[PDB]
Amino acid sequence: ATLKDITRRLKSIKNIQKITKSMKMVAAAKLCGAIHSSVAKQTTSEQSARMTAMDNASKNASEMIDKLTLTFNRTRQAVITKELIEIISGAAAL
Amino acid sequence: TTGRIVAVIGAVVDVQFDEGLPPILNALEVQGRETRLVLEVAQHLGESTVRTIAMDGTEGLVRGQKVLDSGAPIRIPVGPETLGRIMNVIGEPIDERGPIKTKQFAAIHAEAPEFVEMSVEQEILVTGIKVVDLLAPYAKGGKIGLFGGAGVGKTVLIMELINNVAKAHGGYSVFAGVGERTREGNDLYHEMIESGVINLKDATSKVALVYGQMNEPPGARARVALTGLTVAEYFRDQEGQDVLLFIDNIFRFTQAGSEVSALLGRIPSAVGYQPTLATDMGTMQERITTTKKGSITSVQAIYVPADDLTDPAPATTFAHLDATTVLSRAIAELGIYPAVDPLDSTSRIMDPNIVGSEHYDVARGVQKILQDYKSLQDIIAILGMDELSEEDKLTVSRARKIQRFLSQPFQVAEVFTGHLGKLVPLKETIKGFQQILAGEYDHLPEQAFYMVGPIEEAVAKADKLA
Amino acid sequence: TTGRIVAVIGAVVDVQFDEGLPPILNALEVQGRETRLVLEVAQHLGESTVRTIAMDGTEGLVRGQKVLDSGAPIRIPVGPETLGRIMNVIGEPIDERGPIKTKQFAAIHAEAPEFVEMSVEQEILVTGIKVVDLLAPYAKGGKIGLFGGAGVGKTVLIMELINNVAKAHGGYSVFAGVGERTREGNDLYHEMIESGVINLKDATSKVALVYGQMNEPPGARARVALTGLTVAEYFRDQEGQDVLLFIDNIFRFTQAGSEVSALLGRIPSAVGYQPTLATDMGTMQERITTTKKGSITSVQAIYVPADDLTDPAPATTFAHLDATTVLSRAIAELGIYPAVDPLDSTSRIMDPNIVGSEHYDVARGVQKILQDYKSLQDIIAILGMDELSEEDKLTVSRARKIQRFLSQPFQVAEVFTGHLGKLVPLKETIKGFQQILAGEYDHLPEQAFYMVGPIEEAVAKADKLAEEH
Amino acid sequence: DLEETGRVLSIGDGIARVHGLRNVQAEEMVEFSSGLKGMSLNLEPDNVGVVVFGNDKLIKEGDIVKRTGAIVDVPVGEELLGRVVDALGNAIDGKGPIGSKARRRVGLKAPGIIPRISVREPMQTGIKAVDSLVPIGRGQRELIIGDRQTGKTSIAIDTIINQKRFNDGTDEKKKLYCIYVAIGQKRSTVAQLVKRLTDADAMKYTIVVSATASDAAPLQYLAPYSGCSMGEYFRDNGKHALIIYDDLSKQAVAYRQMSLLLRRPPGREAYPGDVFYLHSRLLERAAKMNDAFGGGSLTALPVIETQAGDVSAYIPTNVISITDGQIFLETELFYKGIRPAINVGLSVSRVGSAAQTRAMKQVAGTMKLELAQYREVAAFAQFGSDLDAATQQLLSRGVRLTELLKQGQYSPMAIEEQVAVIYAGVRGYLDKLEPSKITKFENAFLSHVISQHQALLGKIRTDGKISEESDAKLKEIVTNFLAGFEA
Amino acid sequence: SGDNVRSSAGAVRDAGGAFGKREQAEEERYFRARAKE
Numbered sequence A: 001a002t003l004k005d006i007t008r009r010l011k012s013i014k015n016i017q018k019i020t021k022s023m024k025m026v027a028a029a030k031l032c033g034a035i036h037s038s039v040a041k042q043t044t045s046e047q048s049a050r051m052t053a054m055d056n057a058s059k060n061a062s063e064m065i066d067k068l069t070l071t072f073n074r075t076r077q078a079v080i081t082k083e084l085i086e087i088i089s090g091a092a093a094l
Numbered sequence B: 001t002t003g004r005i006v007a008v009i010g011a012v013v014d015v016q017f018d019e020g021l022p023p024i025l026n027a028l029e030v031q032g033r034e035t036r037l038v039l040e041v042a043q044h045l046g047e048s049t050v051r052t053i054a055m056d057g058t059e060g061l062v063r064g065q066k067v068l069d070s071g072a073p074i075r076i077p078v079g080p081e082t083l084g085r086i087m088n089v090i091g092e093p094i095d096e097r098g099p100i101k102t103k104q105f106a107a108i109h110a111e112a113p114e115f116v117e118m119s120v121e122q123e124i125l126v127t128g129i130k131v132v133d134l135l136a137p138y139a140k141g142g143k144i145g146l147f148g149g150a151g152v153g154k155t156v157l158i159m160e161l162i163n164n165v166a167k168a169h170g171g172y173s174v175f176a177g178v179g180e181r182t183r184e185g186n187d188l189y190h191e192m193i194e195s196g197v198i199n200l201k202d203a204t205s206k207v208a209l210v211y212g213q214m215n216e217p218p219g220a221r222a223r224v225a226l227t228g229l230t231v232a233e234y235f236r237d238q239e240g241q242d243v244l245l246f247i248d249n250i251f252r253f254t255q256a257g258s259e260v261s262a263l264l265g266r267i268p269s270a271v272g273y274q275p276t277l278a279t280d281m282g283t284m285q286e287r288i289t290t291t292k293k294g295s296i297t298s299v300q301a302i303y304v305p306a307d308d309l310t311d312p313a314p315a316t317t318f319a320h321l322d323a324t325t326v327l328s329r330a331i332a333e334l335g336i337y338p339a340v341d342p343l344d345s346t347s348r349i350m351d352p353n354i355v356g357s358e359h360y361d362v363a364r365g366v367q368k369i370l371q372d373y374k375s376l377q378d379i380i381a382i383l384g385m386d387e388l389s390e391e392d393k394l395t396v397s398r399a400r401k402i403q404r405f406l407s408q409p410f411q412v413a414e415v416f417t418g419h420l421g422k423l424v425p426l427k428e429t430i431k432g433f434q435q436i437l438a439g440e441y442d443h444l445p446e447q448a449f450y451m452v453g454p455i456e457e458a459v460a461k462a463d464k465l466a
Numbered sequence C: 001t002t003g004r005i006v007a008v009i010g011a012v013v014d015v016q017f018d019e020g021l022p023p024i025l026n027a028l029e030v031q032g033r034e035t036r037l038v039l040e041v042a043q044h045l046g047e048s049t050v051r052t053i054a055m056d057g058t059e060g061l062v063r064g065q066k067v068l069d070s071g072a073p074i075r076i077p078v079g080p081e082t083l084g085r086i087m088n089v090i091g092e093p094i095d096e097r098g099p100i101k102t103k104q105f106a107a108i109h110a111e112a113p114e115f116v117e118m119s120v121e122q123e124i125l126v127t128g129i130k131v132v133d134l135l136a137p138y139a140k141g142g143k144i145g146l147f148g149g150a151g152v153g154k155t156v157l158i159m160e161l162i163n164n165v166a167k168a169h170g171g172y173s174v175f176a177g178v179g180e181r182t183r184e185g186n187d188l189y190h191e192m193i194e195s196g197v198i199n200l201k202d203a204t205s206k207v208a209l210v211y212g213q214m215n216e217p218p219g220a221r222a223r224v225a226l227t228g229l230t231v232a233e234y235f236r237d238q239e240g241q242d243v244l245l246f247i248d249n250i251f252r253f254t255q256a257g258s259e260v261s262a263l264l265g266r267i268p269s270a271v272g273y274q275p276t277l278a279t280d281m282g283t284m285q286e287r288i289t290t291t292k293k294g295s296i297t298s299v300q301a302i303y304v305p306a307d308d309l310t311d312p313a314p315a316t317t318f319a320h321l322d323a324t325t326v327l328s329r330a331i332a333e334l335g336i337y338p339a340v341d342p343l344d345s346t347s348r349i350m351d352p353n354i355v356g357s358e359h360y361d362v363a364r365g366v367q368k369i370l371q372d373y374k375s376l377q378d379i380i381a382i383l384g385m386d387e388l389s390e391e392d393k394l395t396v397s398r399a400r401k402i403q404r405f406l407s408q409p410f411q412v413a414e415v416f417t418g419h420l421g422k423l424v425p426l427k428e429t430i431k432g433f434q435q436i437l438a439g440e441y442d443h444l445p446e447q448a449f450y451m452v453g454p455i456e457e458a459v460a461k462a463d464k465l466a467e468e469h
Numbered sequence D: 001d002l003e004e005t006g007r008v009l010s011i012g013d014g015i016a017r018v019h020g021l022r023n024v025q026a027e028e029m030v031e032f033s034s035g036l037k038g039m040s041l042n043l044e045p046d047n048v049g050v051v052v053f054g055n056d057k058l059i060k061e062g063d064i065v066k067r068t069g070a071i072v073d074v075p076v077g078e079e080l081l082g083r084v085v086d087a088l089g090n091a092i093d094g095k096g097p098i099g100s101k102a103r104r105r106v107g108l109k110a111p112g113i114i115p116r117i118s119v120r121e122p123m124q125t126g127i128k129a130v131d132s133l134v135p136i137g138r139g140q141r142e143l144i145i146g147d148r149q150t151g152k153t154s155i156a157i158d159t160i161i162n163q164k165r166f167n168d169g170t171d172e173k174k175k176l177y178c179i180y181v182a183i184g185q186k187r188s189t190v191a192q193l194v195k196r197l198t199d200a201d202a203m204k205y206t207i208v209v210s211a212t213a214s215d216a217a218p219l220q221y222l223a224p225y226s227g228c229s230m231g232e233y234f235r236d237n238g239k240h241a242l243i244i245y246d247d248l249s250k251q252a253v254a255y256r257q258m259s260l261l262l263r264r265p266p267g268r269e270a271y272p273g274d275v276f277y278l279h280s281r282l283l284e285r286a287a288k289m290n291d292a293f294g295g296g297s298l299t300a301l302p303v304i305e306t307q308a309g310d311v312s313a314y315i316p317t318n319v320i321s322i323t324d325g326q327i328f329l330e331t332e333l334f335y336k337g338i339r340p341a342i343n344v345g346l347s348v349s350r351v352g353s354a355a356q357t358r359a360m361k362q363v364a365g366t367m368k369l370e371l372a373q374y375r376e377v378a379a380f381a382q383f384g385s386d387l388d389a390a391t392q393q394l395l396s397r398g399v400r401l402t403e404l405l406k407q408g409q410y411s412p413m414a415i416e417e418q419v420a421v422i423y424a425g426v427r428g429y430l431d432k433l434e435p436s437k438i439t440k441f442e443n444a445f446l447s448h449v450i451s452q453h454q455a456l457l458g459k460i461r462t463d464g465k466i467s468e469e470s471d472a473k474l475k476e477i478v479t480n481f482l483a484g485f486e487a
Numbered sequence E: 001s002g003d004n005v006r007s008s009a010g011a012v013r014d015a016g017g018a019f020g021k022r023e024q025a026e027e028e029r030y031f032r033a034r035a036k037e
């Protein structure tokens, strides 16, 4: 963990999250899961699947963000705590 | 006994008393100043020398300047004549309406009621405000976290509560502005005057104001919550009332604490707060509960650091809360007032064994219908609100009637709203929503429930608007 | 007056005077050494004892050893005779070319030029680097900051700025080595000797050298910056003449001090730096500036710990610059050099009323399309290159080209790229980007714009590219 | 006489430890042999920790330190207008001496809660973003906060420029005297900063305090107050002053240095425990006084430099709370084209419409609720390859209004000139025009109204709002001017 | 937040990939065309 990195993945996954939710609606209005998958290996459906896919994808990102942020703060608190103990050890060493 | 200042390092002052040494927490009076400069004892350094935290600037102080031991801790004026008045940290009136002529005085430092003095009964403090009383009841003698920044109905919900509790419970109220901004502190004063809660003429004032401005030192800003606390205690232990204590920004109390702590050179704990965090929060918070004589319920506005609920400050504060009133701009926009979120605001006491099975199942039904309607939003917009089964069309409708019935016109809004405020008894609210849930009032238009009082005014408002 | 050493802990030595107590900032000569050892008075501990930071190693000092107060701060040789000579931190010559017979010595410590002494003139200084002159133009006699994490191109870039602007400078130029690699000192010296900017047989030398690199204890690195600055000071005032001041990594001025803070008895501040970090840097930077007496065109290389620009050291250094060129690992990694960030490099003269409207618009036009392209980086990160309307995917295709056209081969970086360094005139740069933003070269492949000079070579290379296919 | 004078025991890093001075007061000035000044922050049994104003090379052990009695004071009054000075009122522009006709203590108690009255009178910044979405009232403490080189300063400079309008006017109740306090900046920048204000003939009514990067720590620490004072003279005399504290961040940095060098107790980020008490007492000093006290005001604009945007950091936190609102600036919005770079969603004044004439109140709100609705569909933007008419329409207004907000630096406009441009936007006239042209429009559009429709602007101001007539006068002015624009 | 995705790994190599791949063929696609012209 590193505040710099977490902050990077959060932003990046918050972005992804936004784009996927947008795609779920477009689909709704109209990657499509295992649709093209099935027929090759062997609309209504196509959009169905795309709706579903982005949906889950949207949740899966939010559940991921929700977990990164906790790690964000835990780690945010830790850094402050670290910086402080360092600051005092030097003072108590004078 | 007289001491002599021998050390001044910012808001910290060490005084040497040759003979009688002043105990810890004892207020000392600095001699030779225009205004009054109080030094609260904090430590006995040894060598007849004591350390202290000033309650106001320390510029001008000189080593050797005389200092007087007031014999006890910081004492302030207590009793009826404090209501309507704005009190300083040390008890001084700052509303310039002259002296605070009281016959009584008390110390801001008082141990919390003992175990025997404890109430074992879980009673609900009726506010008369539907959402509150129905979805997140205020535990009588309990702390409630007021969530919501500004411009969401905070100042209105605060006074209304002052009004209701006064009208339906006879108890007064105190407002401890911890780390208040002189600007909003002023705004609040007049906003209250023009609301009725404060009267600069006839003793009809229902609230006592106590302020701890930001320009005031960490020492000052740390004790205010107690000064205002001591004030409220009088009305509970002396007049057996069920007071209401408002601490706007309990956070700035905490922070006030850390700054004192640091100034005193103590080693910070995790996240830079004071080691004493929990005890600083303990000693004060615990002076707020139901006693055999009466009870004090307190609404404390809370600031979550970095939006992190786990940060020490709040997390140390959530240990003392029984409820949370969450204000929401999302709600305020829809025109729903109070903008209390019906799903984020909650209560510990919202249990059958406490609010009765009946009251419970109602609050629960309303929480679940809103939850159901809040989901549907997607489908309704996208998949179109045309393929909604019978069970799907009623939810959305009923939920909307509920959602709006959650709005209530405050008596303190009369001044501007031009509408008689309403104070709904717990009985009326339960049945009101209890029915809506049944479907008894499905043959009525939405606006019928918007901005009303008891369920009656819903139907009466319906016919008129046809 | 003579003093005696009473405590030696690292670069921090305590000297007790019975006679008179030397004022702070005073240089002290440690007697009994086969190499001049200077101790700078840092504090007055009390009881006739002063604390001092050593301008060299303390290996061998003895408690009670004598210390002669030189009467004043570190004074070093200044003037034309320094030109071509490699100087120490205390003025000692380190080129083995004998003494620096100067007729004047200045104290490396002095007050910063008053406010009434400030100059408000700003004349764009053309560098031939498209990105620089395009997005964040340097200015004549201004303060240039070159930020960059480890090995992204600070040293090579500052080198290009000497091969471009210094060589064709009608005047003197000072270069100070501040806690860097001694090997780089070698390189720069012998390379200046080749180009003839330095003459060992006569007096045509136009650059003065000051060094206190890594192998040096903090104390030295903690002052060399001020040493080199003094040498360039003399060239700015006692002449008025134009002076160019290159300092390779002023960051070693703040680390130096960060490496002796504690031992000076100082509670540490945020991130371990000294509490005096910002003000030390202040009484140091304010001195490196153009006054109404003369002008200094300074180019400082600034290190950025772990690549974090928010680090106190660098974050405090920005406001001291009139133009900043930030390097980016991310960019360097995409094989784009100089690895200059187009979205984080700024300049004070980047105003339409100083560079004209044409120059300005194109610059912001570049920056914008590049910011839009960052916005599509995400969208296409999940979708693929086949969803963007023909309008967006069009900008993505121009971003790439504009991105690549910002890269440029350096004469100084031949040995690296293997190509022939090019030098672009300002006007050819604007035209260059004006046309690409126009849509003109949407028929040419991106690669055509990668590592070239004026916009032409692009088409030319693009052609050499068509024929080869 | 260890009573009125003292001897230096030690002297290091601007912290001189003095023996004697048993009679100095906490926060009192003192002089060293060499004639430098020194504040007295720490009063100890055995010693006095004195903070040094200026390089310490002049102070040696033994050096005498006599009291001055004369607490820290700074010259105040109009004679400072047009003059650039250092943290201690000393002139530093060489224009000669100032007419110090009256002085005032830098360390003074701020006005109470009763000498005040709400914030009503607008504090026109001249910035379309601020005045329409982040309105400032006189007596208000608004914070400018964002990363480095994000334009924080450029919000203060224009806002000052903007003041000329009213300054060269006859309406003396709208006049506003400015105070630009530079903390820890380099002399260089200030000098450019001043020329600008001067080439714009604004310095004539502006005061500049400069505790540059070379001035000693405590000098940088004082300037904010010494400056706040200069503004209070006007605050106490019915006049209104706008004071800008350029980065309190830097001031804090100086305070800490002194704190840690004296060895007080360090806390989060090594800052002393009363760092908050440092800014709180300075920021409260601003106020909209009551008609009884003259009606004067001291409006404050401190600047906070965040790191990577971390506002949850110690000092940013501090100030954020202490002040009345925030105008958030950001790099992304910048290189994007959104200049000034203000985040309408994150920036907020708690005073809102209070200091926003009805002329502005109308157009604003609608825009607000619209920029807001646009702020939801935003994402759908580029990926909306089939968006319904509704959102497609929410996006449209979206881009239109932002371009409007693009304003030129050093180029602020009168509240009326403003509403006149918001008007053409909110009413939907720009909804057809191509995005990249909007700007060129406001440009040709504003000059025009100002050129051939002065009285129309006046009527907006006068009528307090958008009258039925003026709403009619504009609808035709725009329709016609518009139509001719796309010919 | 503009291009956070790319400022990482997993999905960045992808964006990086598709990206280059595209402009790779495209340009070759444009390459011979240059000859035509």
Ligand SMILES: Nc1ncnc2c1ncn2[C@@H]1O[C@H](COP(=O)(O)OP(=O)(O)NP(=O)(O)O)[C@@H](O)[C@H]1O
Binding pocket: C148, C149, C150, C151, C152, C153, C154, C155, C156, C157, C303, C337, C338, C410, C413, C416, C417
């Ligand atoms: N213009 C350039 N063209 C090609 N490669 C370059 C260029 N600039 C830097 N590099 C590469 O990066 C390496 C070193 O960069 P350099 O200029 O020394 O970085 P630096 O910023 O001074 N690093 P350091 O001082 O160690 O933190 C070179 O050896 C090259 O491989």
Ligand SMILES: Nc1ncnc2c1ncn2[C@@H]1O[C@H](COP(=O)(O)OP(=O)(O)NP(=O)(O)O)[C@@H](O)[C@H]1O
Binding pocket: C318, C319, C347, C348, C350, C351, D147, D148, D149, D150, D151, D152, D153, D154, D155, D339, D340, D407, D408, D409
């Ligand atoms: N409205 C504007 N339009 C165009 N450029 C602008 C505008 N406002 C500011 N700028 C420019 O943006 C640059 C930096 O903004 P500036 O006023 O220096 O911000 P800052 O936050 O004070 N930076 P600093 O304090 O030096 O870290 C300058 O070159 C200004 O000319």
Ligand SMILES: [Mg+2]
Binding pocket: C154, C155, C180
């Ligand atoms: Mg290097």
Ligand SMILES: [Mg+2]
Binding pocket: D152, D153, D154
């Ligand atoms: Mg600035």
